Amino acid sequence: LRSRVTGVVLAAGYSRRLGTPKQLLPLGDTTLLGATLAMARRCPFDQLIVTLGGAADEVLEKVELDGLDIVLVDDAGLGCSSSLKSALTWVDPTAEGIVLMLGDQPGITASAVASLIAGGRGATIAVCEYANGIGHPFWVSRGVFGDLAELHGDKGVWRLIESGRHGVRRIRVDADVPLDVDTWDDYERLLASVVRLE
Ligand SMILES: [Cl-]
Ligand SMILES: [Cl-]
């Protein structure tokens, strides 16, 4: 039972405020990126792509990436990455769309991804609607891969979503928006949640 979906975990850059590669931050028995990929592997994807930036060498040494398509890019500047452009070139032609998530959002669930994909069949874009706002994971149909490619950064998908040019389906998830990690404070907050829910 093929899903005809490729998962794309954007894990390049966005680490300058931490002062260390956030992908490698300890999160229990694993790393932050390891935790996200553990979940991503359990989603109904036919293919899983992970993008990495300047810290790729260290990440390759410390995170389990076997069986994944690894897309390596240059650093793009502070608060920016362009890895999605490269990732698209690797997407299997059989994929009807992709699901986008960040390498630093391990709190996303495989059930939410499954519901997102189901709502995304026949929608141009779909997004998760949590109790306290819209957030990742996002669905993007093959028909707008060209528009994605033209975005200036990995975290600029919200501009396509908010543009009104394309249908955007909101898929309800009975949870709050997953935590992500921009700053050291964000990391400690996420770690405390992992410690608590453990
Ligand atoms: Cl940054
Ligand atoms: Cl990086």
Surrounding residues of ion ligand 2, Cβ less than 5 A? 13, 53-55
Distance from the alpha carbon of residue 59 to the mean position of ligand 2, in angstroms:
8
d(CA 32, CA 90): 24
Ligand nearest to the CA of 104: 2
What strand order describes the sheet that includes 69-72? 69-72, 47-52, 5-11, 97-102, 133-141, 125-130, 168-172
What does DSSP say about strands 97-102 and 133-141: parallel, antiparallel, or unpaired? antiparallel
Per-residue HEC secondary structure of 24-86 comes to: HCEECCEEHHHHHHHHHHCCCCCEEEEEECCCHHHHHHHCCCCCCEEEECCCCCCCCCCHHHH
Cα(84) to ligand 2 centroid in Å equals 13
Amino acid 46 reads D
Domains of the chain, by residue range, sit at 1-198
> Cβ of 197: how many Cβ atoms within 10 Å?
7
Phi, psi of 144 (to 5 degrees): -115, 15
Phi-psi region of 27 (alpha: psi -120 to 50; beta: other; left: phi over 0): beta
What spacing in Å lies between the alpha carbon of 15 and ligand 1's midpoint? 5
What's the CA-to-centroid distance between 154 and ligand 2, angstroms? 13
Are 82 and 154 a contacting pair, CB within 8 Å? yes
CA of 16 to the centre of ligand 1 (A): 4
Measured from the alpha carbon of residue 56, the closest ligand is 2
**Under a CB-based contact definition with an 8 Å cutoff, are residues 18 and 184 in contact?**
yes
Are 123 and 144 within 8 A, CB to CB? no
CATH architecture of 1-198: Alpha-Beta Complex (3.90)
| Closest ligand to the CA of 80 | 1
Cα–Cα distance for residue pair 58/157, rounded to 1 Å = 28
Q: Which residues pair with 127 in a beta bridge?
A: 138, 170
